[PDB]
Amino acid sequence: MEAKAVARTIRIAPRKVRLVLDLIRGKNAAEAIAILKLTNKASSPVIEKVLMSALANAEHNYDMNTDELVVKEAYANEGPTLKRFRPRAQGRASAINKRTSHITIVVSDAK
Amino acid sequence: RQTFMANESNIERKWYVIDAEGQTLGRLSSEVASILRGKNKVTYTPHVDTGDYVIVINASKIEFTGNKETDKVYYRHSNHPGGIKSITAGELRRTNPERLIENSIKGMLPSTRLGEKQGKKLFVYGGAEHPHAAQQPENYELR
Amino acid sequence: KLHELKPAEGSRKERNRVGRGVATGNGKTSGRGHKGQKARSGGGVRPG
Amino acid sequence: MFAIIETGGKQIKVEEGQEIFVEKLDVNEGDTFTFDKVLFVGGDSVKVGAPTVEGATVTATVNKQGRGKKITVFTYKRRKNSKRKKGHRQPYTKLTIDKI
Amino acid sequence: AVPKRRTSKTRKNKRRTHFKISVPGMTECPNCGEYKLSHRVCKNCGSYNG
Amino acid sequence: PRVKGGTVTRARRKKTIKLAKGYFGSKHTLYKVAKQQVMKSGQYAFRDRRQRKRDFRKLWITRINAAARQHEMSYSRLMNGLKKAGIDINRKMLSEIAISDEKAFAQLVTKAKDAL
RNA sequence: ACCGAUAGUGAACCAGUACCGUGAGGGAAAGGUGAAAAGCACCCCGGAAGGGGAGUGAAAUAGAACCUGAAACCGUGUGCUUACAAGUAGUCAGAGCCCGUUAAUGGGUGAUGGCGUGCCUUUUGUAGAAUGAACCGGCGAGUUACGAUUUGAUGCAAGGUU
RNA sequence: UAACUUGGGAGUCAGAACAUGGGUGAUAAGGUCCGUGUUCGAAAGGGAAACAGCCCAGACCACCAGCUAAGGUCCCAAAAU
RNA sequence: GACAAUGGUAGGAGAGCGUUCUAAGGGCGUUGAAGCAUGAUCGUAAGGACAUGUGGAGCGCUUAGAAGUGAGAAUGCCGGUG
């Protein structure tokens, strides 16, 4: 079986989250948890909470053992941006996109 | 509809050996190039090489008609500003004849991915002996 | 029969529509030729 | 042994039990046809000559009579606002060489 | 200067080939049982014991 | 009455984006690049349908010239002798015999040598 | 034989309002759950946001960022191919490898060979280093009234008709 | 196998190179202005390496058939070492 | 059935496809409308069908009529996204 967990409209640009999602995709579960704990990136705690959620749905929602699961999928999609501005020299004003993201994680026991 | 096309499995390539003693450069070169392109085979397919391997012994005996040992300069640039080196066709034979025949013959092969793989079947030695005895090279006579 | 009507043969024609495609042959320039006073919305000269 | 037959302004190299696709003929599906012009028969023990081996009419059967698949003939001239589009399906008949 | 011409998503995806991060370079602490960074202290309940 | 032009533009812009599939990159995704590429492809196919018939005659001429030199004829002398003898097999059939029946190309070359 | 939310009033919405100008004055953009709120009791991860269930419902990728949900664009997996090669990026020929349809001289990929300097406008002539376009979607240009003239049709006819 | 008359409808009034009879220029110009013919403009295909205007020749569509024109036949590259 | 003809800009002539609406006739639809996605289908072209998924209530066919009638390009307007 597979369990899944999502986090929607996380306020971090998607191509900043895809950098650290690529380190834990494929690894074991207890290894990916330590990887997310010991990395400098600002998006580490968010992915760690989403991963722990998908590891907790497995124990209760569909009974299975949490010492066998592997991160079968982990990806980040776009979400609605925010449109802000920055007033520059000589009257001009430039745009600012505050990107968001949707982080999905699917953990499977290989069965 | 009905035209036979050669495939790698069908191809059977032979080994020839030619004597470049007492021959002219361009007249030997055109025929060796026709042998390398495989235009001497009824089963000739343009997209894949059906040619044979050639071994050219006695490269130090090719000769040039006329006053070609001092004329017929070979030029080449190094890509740095100013550097355009040269060598006459008479000083190249006595120094490195096997490059003379090789460049002559490879200037007659099309410059395409297959025009290099067809041109690396030529083995040119200056002197009667060649290492490739383990391939049973037949002895071809130019015409 | 109001569901079967036919005009007398030769009584109706299609109007011609310029400015719609190159197959018609009137799409670009609309039969007005190249740049001139006679090729401008507005028009040409007074008659005579 | 094989043979060479001339049907549609072309020659064809036929063996018994071979399916050929030639130009349209007026024979109907299920019938049998007979090729007269035969330029070269044999290929086992007997060779022959031309313009026509007098005799040796290959006998086939009209297997099908249909149309090729559509090719679109599109062409244009750059900057002249002239283009053109046509579509084409060339009819054929499929036969099977019964006996040479 | 300004880019003369737009960048394909082939050229962009090639140039982002080496733009990545690496695994944190971690060991397993032989007191905490858990994972830790080599030459650093055990961030879990524990010490260094070097 | 007002016509809002809906469902007509997409159906004819989508018939072209799928008539160009396999094309590199934006040439299979966007309309204004896929359209030009499909137009060029139509013109190229028109030209190649007529260059094909010459390419294959050159191929047949090369194989029959390579098959005739193994009997010490040229290609031009073999063709001249075949014309005089009255044998009218095309180059396509002559190449096929030369490949799949050498004992028949021998007969053809004997007749074309005896016809002078 | 009027429009149907880029249309119809500038305004189907609490618009002549946010706003913007010292002022006179200028001016948008914003529609839709379901038949009925029955608008998610309760359990679990999380500080909350947000989920995963289980329930309401005919439907929850109907959960108030609510009908449908497309293109550009951003990703995840995979079938064939690609690190000695000079590419308006395709077309014609053609091995190998993987599949199996509106069933028909089948679909996908492409080792290699031949041919091949985009589109529009403006010009004696542009591949042009002459112009225009970042891409996608919607909107967007020979029309109506009244007269004149020529042609086709129809009715009467030395008469025709308001 | 065209021509003319009457009527509806247009576009065109920036031309270019080559061959030849001339002016002007310096028997200079891919110059400029006239008479005469061709092609381009509005014309694809083959040749001239490439190449609007030069040589051959005018594409209704299909074919893995044949004969030729300019030009060519040692290899690139079809056909005479 | 025999013979010929069929390059083309500006522009001139003819025959047509498709869109929204109206009249009259004849139909389809919760046993699933239009739309929208895919497909290896048909027609000389514009374009016409059929099958599957989705969606959730309207819509085609025939013959005539009337037009806000078909857009790649206006340093085009608006929205979105690189």
Side-chain angles (χ1 to χ4, degrees), chain D residues 39-58:
Chain D
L39 305 206
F40 193 107
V41 80
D44 65 330
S45 82
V46 178
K47 317 304 170 287
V48 288
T52 293
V53 182
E54 270 87 30
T57 68
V58 181

Side-chain angles (χ1 to χ4, degrees), chain B residues 1, chain D residues 5 7-8 12 14-35 58-66 91-99:
Chain B
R1 176 159 35 162
Chain D
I5 58 182
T7 59
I12 291 169
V14 297
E15 306 213 55
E16 315 152 323
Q18 165 170 350
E19 269 150 350
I20 68 189
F21 297 82
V22 301
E23 285 292 3
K24 205 179 81 84
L25 312 160
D26 212 316
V27 289
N28 303 155
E29 302 172 279
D31 299 353
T32 62
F33 203 62
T34 292
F35 298 108
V58 181
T59 297
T61 193
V62 195
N63 215 10
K64 182 187 165 78
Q65 209 165 24
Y92 66 80
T93 73
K94 163 163 99 152
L95 299 92
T96 293
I97 313 297
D98 269 323
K99 163 181 180 65

Side-chain angles (χ1 to χ4, degrees), chain F residues 13-73:
Chain F
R13 281 206 191 116
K14 174 179 296 302
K15 286 198 180 109
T16 294
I17 298 175
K18 308 208 274 162
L19 202 50
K21 98 172 175 61
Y23 292 7
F24 175 87
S26 277
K27 287 185 156 87
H28 70 256
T29 322
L30 307 187
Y31 176 71
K32 273 142 71 142
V33 297
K35 190 195 163 169
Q36 311 176 199
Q37 187 55 255
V38 175
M39 306 201 310
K40 299 271 293 168
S41 299
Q43 179 81 67
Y44 280 157
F46 189 94
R47 183 198 71 210
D48 288 328
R49 279 196 286 258
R50 279 168 221 240
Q51 287 168 354
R52 170 201 308 154
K53 306 159 178 39
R54 333 163 179 170
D55 281 17
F56 271 97
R57 179 158 170 174
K58 288 184 179 196
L59 190 60
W60 302 324
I61 290 188
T62 323
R63 308 207 287 210
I64 297 154
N65 196 2
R69 303 263 174 179
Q70 309 193 98
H71 300 255
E72 314 294 321
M73 312 205 67

